[PDB]
């Protein structure tokens, strides 16, 4: 429906794909990476019913679904399913026909090159899309920020990066891939709220938590004094409607659940935690990057959105670096969006129109191309 | 129909109250950001003078 | 009467209640968690006759009670009839007064903290008992089964707790807590009973059902090769008398209500079955600790108790785990009492007279206590 | 049990530690540099479990452990693991009270002198020896290579030192330290084979990597060659089993890891590899000095270990040389133990009789004693 051949940009991730055109400074909708499946047994006669329901339609009929997600820590390993979560996005609610628009995909820099491989291939040969790109996401968040410059800190519902920048330079030996995300951070308060008598286990369920989790969650600047005072008083709870009429409150659970983020060992990690990890891709760099590394400590994803983590991170690393350092968190409301929206001022910048793919690129080169024209 | 419009207006009420509590959060945020400013405007303020003082002496 | 001031020992499950000394081989008796009620006008006067039956009383007088369980999914959830089958069992099979002896309750870390502080309160504000402790299940089934590292699955009456521990250590995010027990498979058998002609829905059919359940039923290490003779010929099928002279018999249904076990759909749960839960408790330890668990996975609790079950797991196991590994199952005749036997070693262990809350800390903290000291 | 109060020899490196008594021919035992350490909470009573684990110990345990390496790029900062490291050497393996036999402890003099006067001290302060005597490796090397002359390459897992000796005599401003070694290549190992699809970040997983590389590795003495038939055939991949029954097959990453000490840019190092600096070391000697340094280059330490790197230095030192000039690499079978070799030669020397530092002239001059007496 657009009048213009304008590339399309689609951020995968393991809990929703943004979607929408390049140029405008938002997704048209969030689509959750869901393909639900019944799981029970149909009684009655003439009731339609499909074998699988895709993005909001899993979650809108998933009182008998079971629900998966076709993404793993940032890896696509279930691709039929995201040929659905794909058609559906262009097809049913972005209107969008790929065949006559350059396509960008993001991805973290150091997820294995089968995934970026792939999903040059999908475009190209299952929606036929004249050209490719897939970028990366520290890249996308220090764009849409307005920064060159910065550690970027993701904390995903996937996994969380860790990339320092400088002068648009990628600085690798200074990277922290880590296994830690918001997936892990809602299993840790499923357990907690089965010890306050709510066992959350099934589809439904696990949604619910999510949501939970969403609405209710924070970090806390100080977690020791949270921790102290939401174990001792009510003053601390708060309420959640679950969807029967019947509700949940919440203590110190609160907090304990996006504590994990600074504290992998609730989980079973083996981790230095999100502000040491970035601290540490600080500290890596070479002596006159690392103050411009300190004073941009930039924010990406979702989960920075949580009360007192912008303030959180920026004193854990000031009390792991010296003196006369200045450090400091970007922090845009860009927050939970600012990969889709750095993929739609890329994939138009005048000095990335040779960047892209072609798809007579793409087929004389094999898919392997990824690998010499994105990254 | 009153109820339709109940249901709409309650979700007007659940949308508004959506609203407030983001507002409310913004507000907090804000509101908390204010005061870590009110601290930091007034410490600067305060190494305003430190330093002036550092380059006094 | 007895010979050393020792501990007491309480299996309190959501079937059946073990209880015994520490010390002792087993318990010495063993009661159903079940408070009867009567559920008829009496005619005739100076019938005796109780306003509430306990344990094995329930039983024997249950052709006109309707019989409840106080615990269900591992939890109490009323406290009073707890309290209830506690005095008959300690005082009038066990001979014994808690008063003077310190007494060990067992839970699954994953029920909700209530459980373990109601079985705290009542023996120290009904019973004055001078200390106790509650105890995991799964570390009473790894005493009583010769080991410190495996995988405890545990498959009780009300929940199936599934976890991972090494060198006598937890690995708690690897905890695949399973909502499907041997109370399901009960009701599960009632239903396909009901197709065979035999409906059964009050308390005296309920725990015949449970009765039939526990002699005819078995798992089969092949349930499909199992199925085609089953299915096909009446040798397969086994009679059971019925209290009133009538006789049922089951056929294929033998093993195809254990077999939920394998296929939770059968009863509505979301869950691939408890070999798929061992696989991935073992799949989140790290890759050094795997090749131990994967050589130990042992079996604890009732429900274990089908013929074929230590097979069936083994291979349901390898089918899901990498080649050259050896997969082995630990499945000891201490079936079902295992946990009991776990209970006796461990409230007797020099090791663990630390472990023991007393009355005077019971007292000064509050029953909150046990959520501390315990585990 | 040495029947004679020979010298102690131990070459603690950043990776592993080699152990034994001057006058023999090879360490009594090899220690990983590591001290293990328990991250999970104990859950079953009586069970053991130490709080540390030491050298093979931590590795034999590392199931549950974190394993930390006391030594960073060459220098000791960890000392409380270290004094566990030569308790456990001396108590345990080589079965000596080293207040019976003086010690000879080995680095490279450019080193952080702190490292040598705290070598010097725990031998003395700790374990009361008799005497110290910290010795230069590249000295070590030379003595077991059967030389007095020649350039000294040792990268090891820390850092690579480059030294030029002439007639036993160092050519100091010849030196060329670079912070390049087997820590970074394995780092880059890790990367790539993430890249292609195994992504290895926990310590289990770390010491797998590590153990890839000793295993797999290589570097061909043609890079260019090598480089184009990995990327062209399948002849050049091998297999690798791990702890679990998990197979890798690695193709080039094979020989890139190696391949970043002739591109330390892999890395984020600024170097133009350890060919440059071996040839450097060279040049920056007087040219009367250059004909027996390009005709004796000796390997020593480990990494010379695969193969075509004693000809791929010989062809990339001759290509940087003049013409005319014989170029020669001395890469004998006693590598990576040669340095210990080198230990035990000298501790023994009747040359070498008055080069040990007492437990006199120690405490009467103090740590920087070693400043003076050893290098």
Redesign the interface.
Known sequence: DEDETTALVCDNGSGLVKAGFAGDDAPRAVFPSIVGRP??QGVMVGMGQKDSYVGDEAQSKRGIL?LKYPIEHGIITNWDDMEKIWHHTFYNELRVAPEEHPTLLTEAP?????NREKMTQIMFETFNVPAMYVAIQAVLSLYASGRTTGIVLDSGDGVTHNVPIYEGYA????IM???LAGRDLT??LM?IL????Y?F???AEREIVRDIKEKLCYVALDFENEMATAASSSSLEKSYELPDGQVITIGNERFRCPETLFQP?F????SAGIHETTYNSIM?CDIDIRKDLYANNVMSGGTTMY?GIA?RMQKEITALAPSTMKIKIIAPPERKYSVWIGGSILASLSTFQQMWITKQEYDEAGPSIVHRKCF | IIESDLERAEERAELSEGKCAELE?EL??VT?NLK?LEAQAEKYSQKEDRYEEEIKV
């Open positions: 799981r029970h079971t150091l997820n294995p090159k089968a600085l690798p030996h200074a891939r880590l296994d299993d840790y357990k089965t010890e306050r008598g066992s286990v099934t589809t060992s989980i079973g990690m083996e890596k009360p303030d | 959060e907090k945020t908390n870590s």
